RNA sequence: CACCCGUGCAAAAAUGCAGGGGUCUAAAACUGAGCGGAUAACCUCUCUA
């Protein structure tokens, strides 16, 4: 099922005028020369260990047979020939967009004869789209609740505070849009950002340079700029003192949480470690258990320890009840003593271990390699893991915490986090972006970002050995430094989640947390002002107060949800008995029994159904009753601890439900921002590839239009189908008849304003923001791709209900009631302006095609 | 179960087979990671808000 050519050991079949460099696989994603192809003669480069010897070379194909790993025999193609045969007939093949000469004359000053650097230069794109999505995602946080999509680093704060007695009203009102963000309230659930110990609110100062730091890369990442501020996120350390400052206090508050008293904080694991590895010095496990628990060592050596680890304790019995108050530390020191082998002794089997995994065909030869693997470890530390295990005794931990180690912290500090005079501006913004996202959004920016700069890096390494023109231009100087920002992002993704500068639960928090799980209509303002008084008591008891902060406000899910949405608004949402149903058959039984064991006191149907309702029917006043039972453990048998288990697992089943609801949802909206995004820089790059596309800012379709090569006649395409407009396309993607005349007919079908509006509701996340009003109606949710489409179709309903529709607009309204659910056809109308790249076009207007992780079937 | 590309055969211009694709998607292999519905320098629960 997966690429044979990879498990042989072929890194990549790389391109230089008329010779094909093969390359293999190194430490991790380090790639290393392996062959020079030149016209059926191969010259074996990498000569001691070899991954892969080709047995014989053709002019259409390189037969490679696998040395490191299972003897695995593949075929790869030549890249001269990428586009030729059966159709001079060998030269170096161009991007599916065609635009990789203008690429290479953008990022570099000239055009390159070879397929290395438009590898590079699709990975820095790649770079681009990812904080496109998540510059987007922090600003609609920002505007969840005109002013931040027009936040220029240009001017600090003690330029825009001038305009408090500003004559004209754009800037008054910018200003008074400033105040009355900052004001609110929400700023505290951007806390690591916003919130400093003095926990208060940072100074003006240093709340709009995060601010102008957050709009300014969502302008640079959305709207294709003209000028120095092109080059804006890699000409970083131009950016102004209180910038750069701002970067600084918000960078190094973790690292200082972190490496200020790591031996203190860490005692019960360094000291129960300590005893398991006696003969080791203990500056020298110090210095490793920082290694592996703060800077993730244990991820980079290229397989999953946290997967053998699993594989080993599957069932040998730590998966009891007892060890969940310790099961943290057991795993994380089960992974360290893991580490620690495969450093120091097992070096040998982490390598034959990395090479099988790269070998393997299958997800069962990995599980199976894994397996293997594991059961070795597992006779290996039998012991170890029961030592692990008994010295984390509740009596043995506080005794841990107790004691006074005085351990030699010249070896600790010298791996400790580089503090933020030391990393770069644009690691730190990155560090500042993550700021306003959910973990799942923190790993799969920062994971992805650190996989790109690798691919860059290794890139770079590899045309420097070859000894091609590796110099960036002049502007983007900045992937010079690759390496360094490669070396700087795994350091931050290393500790990026480690800390949460959580602040007390104000007020308003509250506010927001019974807000998001439900009150009676009837209710007024002053009536819940009232009940808020009594959670916070204007004798005393805070039972229920800690009961709401501790379900509601601290839970990451709640978090979310009033990080992306209005809690009334995510309350309403929960009203919608097909959508809350959809995620309930999404979870899986496993995680569904995990709350119908607590909200019980037969069949899986029955027990979603009754879960949905109950996630409809809740309301605070069904846990207003918490200050009697939330000083009982949750742990113990009486009934008040039943109970505050059964209330604990309906709230945290209603803040999963919404919260996977909303993170889909915000999901999908990312997947077009990523489009859209591709559709603004694409149109620029063409531009300067001489295709003649005008302004796509009056209508996003210019760009497919251009690429198509037709033109509006008067307001409509006039233009029909012919082979003769399908194969003199702008672009590779269009060079087919069929998809031509598909994404013709669409065009034909969409309206500029439409096309607009879809384009500002996808990047101002409008959709989402009024999500409880766009989903009033709806019959089924299929999938979350098709909720999307019916909100991003309720809105464009909304705002065109009162205006003039074209006949096919007003065709997919009528559908849209006809039956309750998104228009298959109006979802590829509204998303042509991305339809010149044909497999995002196919992606985003077919379900199934939509998500990796759920395929399903093309429509044709 | 997308798109494209190479090759072999049938084709009279596209279908079976076998593959490849970092230079096709959110999308190369190991990882990290997402899917995903607890993970986190900090035992847990209570406490503190
Ligand atoms: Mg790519």
């Not at 027009?150 to 009102?173: L, P, Q, V, Y």
Request: net charge neutral.
């Amino acid at each position: 099922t997966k690429s044979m050519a990879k498990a042989a050991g072929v890194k990549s079949v790389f391109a230089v005028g008329n010779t094909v460099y093969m390359t293999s696989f190194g430490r991790g994603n380090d790639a290393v020369l392996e062959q020079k192809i030149v016209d059926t003669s191969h010259e074996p480069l990498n000569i001691d260990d070899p991954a892969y010897q080709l047995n014989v070379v053709t002019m259409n194909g390189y037969s490679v047979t696998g040395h490191r790993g299972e003897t695995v025999s593949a075929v790869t193609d030549n890249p001269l020939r990428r586009f030729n045969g059966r159709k001079p007939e060998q030269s170096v093949p161009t991007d599916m967009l065609c635009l990789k000469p203008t690429l290479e004359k953008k990022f570099f000053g000239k055009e390159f004869d070879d397929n290395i650097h438009i590898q590079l230069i699709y990975n820095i794109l790649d770079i681009e789209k990812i904080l496109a999505v998540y510059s987007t995602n922090a600003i609609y946080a920002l505007n969840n609740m005109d002013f931040f999509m027009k936040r220029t680093t240009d001017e600090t704060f003690d330029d825009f505070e001038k305009k408090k007695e500003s004559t004209n009203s754009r800037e008054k009102a910018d200003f008074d849009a400033f105040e009355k963000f900052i004001g609110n309230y929400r700023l505290a659930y951007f806390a690591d950002a916003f919130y400093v110990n003095k926990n208060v609110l940072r100074e003006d100062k240093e709340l709009y340079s995060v601010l102008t730091l957050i709009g300014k890369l969502r302008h640079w990442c959305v709207h294709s700029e003209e000028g120095r501020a092109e080059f804006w996120l890699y000409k970083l350390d131009e950016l102004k003192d209180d910038f750069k400052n701002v970067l600084d206090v918000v960078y190094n508050r973790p690292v200082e949480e972190i490496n200020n008293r790591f031996i203190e904080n860490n005692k019960v694991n360094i000291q129960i470690l300590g005893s398991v590895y006696k003969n080791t010095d203990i500056a020298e496990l110090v210095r490793s258990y920082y290694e592996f628990l703060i800077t993730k060592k244990y991820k980079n050596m290229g397989f999953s320890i946290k997967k053998l680890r699993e594989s080993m304790l599957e069932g040998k019995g730590y998966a009891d009840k007892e060890y969940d108050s310790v099961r943290n530390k057991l795993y994380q020191m089960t992974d360290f003593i893991l580490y620690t082998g495969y450093i120091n002794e097992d070096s040998d089997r982490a390598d034959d271990l990395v090479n099988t995994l790269r070998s393997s065909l299958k997800e069962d030869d990995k599980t199976t390699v894994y397996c293997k693997e594991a059961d070795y470890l597992w006779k290996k530390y039998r012991e170890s893991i029961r030592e692990v295990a008994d010295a984390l005794d509740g009596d043995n931990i506080k005794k841990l915490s107790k004691s006074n180690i005085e351990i030699q912290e010249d070896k600790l500090r010298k791996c400790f986090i580089s503090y933020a005079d030391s990393v770069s501006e644009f690691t730190k913004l990155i560090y500042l972006l993550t700021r306003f996202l959910s973990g799942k959004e923190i790993n799969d920016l920062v994971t992805t970002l650190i996989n790109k700069f690798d691919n860059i890096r290794s890139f770079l390494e590899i045309m420097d050995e070859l000894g091609l023109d590796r110099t960036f231009t002049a502007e983007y100087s900045f992937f010079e430094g690759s390496t360094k920002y490669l070396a700087e992002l795994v350091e931050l993704n290393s500790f990026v989640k480690s800390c949460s500068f959580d602040i007390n639960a104000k007020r308003t928090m509250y506010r927001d947390a019974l807000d998001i799980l439900g009150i009676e209509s009837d209710k007024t303002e002053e009536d819940i002002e009232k009940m808020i008084d009594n959670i916070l008591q204007i004798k005393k008891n805070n039972g229920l107060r800690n009961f709401i902060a501790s379900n509601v406000i601290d839970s990451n899910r709640f978090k979310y949800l009033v990080r992306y949405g209005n809690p009334k608004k995510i309350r309403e949402t929960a009203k919608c008995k097909p959508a809350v149903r959809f995620v309930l058959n999404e979870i899986p039984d496993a995680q569904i029994e995990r709350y119908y064991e607590a909200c019980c006191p037969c069949s899986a149907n029955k027990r979603r159904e009754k879960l949905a309702d109950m996630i409809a029917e809740i309301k605070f006043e069904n846990f207003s009753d918490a200050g009697n039972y939330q000083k009982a453990n949750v742990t113990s048998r009486t009934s008040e601890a039943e109970i505050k288990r059964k209330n604990q697992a309906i709230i945290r089943l209603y803040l999963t439900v919404m919260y996977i609801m909303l993170k889909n949802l915000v999901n999908v909206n990312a997947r077009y921002v990523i489009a859209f995004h591709c559709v603004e820089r694409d149109t620029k790059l063409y531009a300067e590839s001489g295709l003649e596309v005008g302004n796509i800012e009056k209508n996003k379709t210019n760009l497919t239009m251009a690429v198509m090569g037709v033109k509006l006649e008067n307001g409509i395409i006039k233009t029909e189908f012919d082979k003769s407009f399908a194969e003199n396309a702008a672009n590779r993607y269009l060079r087919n008849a069929r998809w031509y005349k598909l994404i013709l007919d669409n065009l034909k079908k969409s309206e500029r304003a439409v096309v607009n509006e879809f384009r500002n509701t996808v990047c101002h996340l409008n959709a989402i923001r009024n999500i409880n009003i766009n989903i009033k109606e709806i019959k089924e949710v299929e999938n979350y791709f098709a909720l999307y489409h019916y909100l991003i179709q309720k809105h464009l309903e909304n705002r065109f209900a009162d205006k003039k529709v074209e006949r096919d607009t007003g065709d997919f309204i009528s559908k849209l009631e006809e039956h309750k659910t998104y228009c298959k056809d109006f979802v590829k109308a509204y998303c042509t302006p991305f339809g010149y790249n044909l497999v995002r076009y196919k992606n985003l207007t077919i379900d199934g095609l939509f998500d990796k992780n759920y395929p399903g079937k093309d429509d044709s």
